[PDB]
């Protein structure tokens, strides 16, 4: 095996076509399916893999009760091929309530954070064995991307945060070669709160679109140089902001150099990537709740501040259905790098009081240079047919 480099250009994207759907919640009503949250897709050179933070229990289980807590000792990173539901034969590759997984072309690297909130330890498991570990440096909740990391020429970069979820936090970018942390760069630039990044390879570097839980409904951008370990940071230029909660389309704004201070007190994991001067971004249709999901391109939305000329809008999940975390992952094609994204379809407690569990499904969409149609691909599970 050779080190995966991502040297091909980005594929032409005219939109996104459906790629995968697990139907996990629908299958949970008639089988042993893991309770999961915060899923992501990461691909090795041959095939793509599902990842999720299991809750240590199945849905039709007494332990699925009150599975809405983010950090428990029983949370493990589940891993199987994309399209295979998280059944009892699923492999829990590590203990983690925060995770990030990437393939360098030779072996899988898993960054897994578990332990106490104030004294968390992040384990760096490469090729199935623990190679390195770090402790919490701010003595607050240490976390990571909750999505795939990016390895360029054997150097994997992961964005880790440790600090306040509603204030200043110490975000560090960790550079990892074969599981060993060779460098650590603090976040530098205009972004004032970076967490839960969706990182994609933009050769020769790594571009991450993160989530601002402090002050911005516009998404921070982190540009990682994997050679000299330098970090630049800004915000997405488009005036159509991708974080929720947010202002409506006519009142939202972004100026690429600071948080917009427009319902920036929270956020959701999302994604964005640049197609030249334009930006392809996905966001929930609901401005307040994580209900629905849409993707569109903003013309000059990456270079021109406060750009609101949107085009090629696709409804991934309609308004009336719950969405959740979304993230980007890249696939090496024959001649170019394709940008694909997943959407988490959260179901259960904290919005739906008909059941005691909180699990999710995933729907995956890959960028396409051809044509496509419309449609909605929600969870599809009747909450009245599920076990309580």
């Amino acid at each position, epitope marked *: 095996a050779e080190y995966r480099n991502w040297s091909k250009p980005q594929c032409n994207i005219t939109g996104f076509a459906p790629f995968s759907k697990d139907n996990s919640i629908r299958l949970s009503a008639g089988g042993d399916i893991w309770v999961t949250r915060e899923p992501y897709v990461s691909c090795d050179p041959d095939k793509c893999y599902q990842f999720a933070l299991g809750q240590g229990t199945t849905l039709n289980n007494g332990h699925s009760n009150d599975t809405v807590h983010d950090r428990t000792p029983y949370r493990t990173l589940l891993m199987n091929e994309l399209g295979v539901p998280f059944h009892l034969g699923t492999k829990q590759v590590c203990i983690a309530w925060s995770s990030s997984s990437c393939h360098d072309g030779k072996a899988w690297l898993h960054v897994c954070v578990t332990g106490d909130d104030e004294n968390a330890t992040a384990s760096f498991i490469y090729n199935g064995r623990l190679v390195d570990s770090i402790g919490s440096w701010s003595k607050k909740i240490l976390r990571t991307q909750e999505s795939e990391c990016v390895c360029i020429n054997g150097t994997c970069t992961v964005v880790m945060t440790d600090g306040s979820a509603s204030g200043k936090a110490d975000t560090k970018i960790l550079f990892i070669e074969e599981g060993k942390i060779v460098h650590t760069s603090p976040l530098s*630039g205009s972004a004032q709160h970076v967490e839960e990044c969706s990182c994609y390879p933009r050769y020769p570097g790594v571009r991450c679109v993160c989530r601002d839980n402090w002050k911005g409904s516009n998404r921070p951008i982190v540009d990682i*140089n994997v050679k000299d370990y330098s970090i*630049v940071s800004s915000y997405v230029c488009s005036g159509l902001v991708g974080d929720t909660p947010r202002k409506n389309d006519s009142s939202s704004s972004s100026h*690429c150099l*600071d948080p917009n201070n427009e319902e920036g007190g929270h956020g959701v994991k999302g994604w964005a990537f640049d197609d030249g001067n334009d930006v392809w971004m996905g966001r929930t249709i609901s401005e307040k709740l994580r209900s629905g999901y849409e993707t569109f391109k903003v013309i000059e939305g990456w270079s021109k501040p406060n750009s609101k000329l949107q085009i090629n809008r696709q409804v991934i999940v309609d308004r009336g259905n719950r969405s959740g975390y979304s993230g980007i992952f890249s696939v090496e094609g024959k001649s170019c790098i394709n940008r694909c994204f997943y959407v988490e379809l959260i179901r259960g407690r904290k919005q739906e009081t008909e059941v005691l569990w909180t699990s999710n499904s995933i729907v995956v969409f890959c960028g396409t240079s051809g044509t496509y149609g419309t449609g909605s691909w929600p969870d599809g599970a009747d909450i009245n047919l599920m076990p309580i």
Partner: antibody
Amino acid sequence: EVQLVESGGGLVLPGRSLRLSCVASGFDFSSFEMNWVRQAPGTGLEWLSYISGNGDTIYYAESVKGRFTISRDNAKNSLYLQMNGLRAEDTATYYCARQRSVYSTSRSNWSVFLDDWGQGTLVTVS
Amino acid sequence: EIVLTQSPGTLSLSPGESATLSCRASQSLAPNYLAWFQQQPGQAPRLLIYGASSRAAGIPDRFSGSGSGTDFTLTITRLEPEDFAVYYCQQYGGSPPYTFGQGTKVEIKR
């Protein structure tokens, strides 16, 4: 043209207070970030304070943190530096600098710098 | 904190020659956040190169910036009498202590 004129300064006694004013002209004041840079006589440039376009984000140098206080009035296009507890080490020419951002489409990541500097104001603490 | 260190604290060159000024960052600094300023003995600082590689408006092609990470360089080919000043490299935009370099004076050698 973009111009910044620093006011205030003069002669002050140690432990007193001063309020420099940087009046901006030729650009939308609220859209750019403002910085205070002082240069002691015979010494290099020293960056002191930073303020965002709306004043929410403010940074201070370790030397002047707690004593100095930066503020701005976007309606009056004015940048203020309220100094407190002045010492002899605060004798310097104080510059008001505006941050500028250039996209740099080759890199695509918004190079950020201080471009427009005023002629400065001399503050002597004695 | 990024601490910038200009290596040639004082430089002695001759008109028409090429001067090379270096700025060293304590940690890896992005090129986007390094700028070069030229200050005459009785004038305000003037921005020459921003982004460590791109000349400012009105700056002649004499000045050329380069470098990334921890090493940044300023090149002044075909020196002129107005190019003998104090040159500062500043880290701005990366981390809140936006400090300047200690400065580099370019002098006429005789």
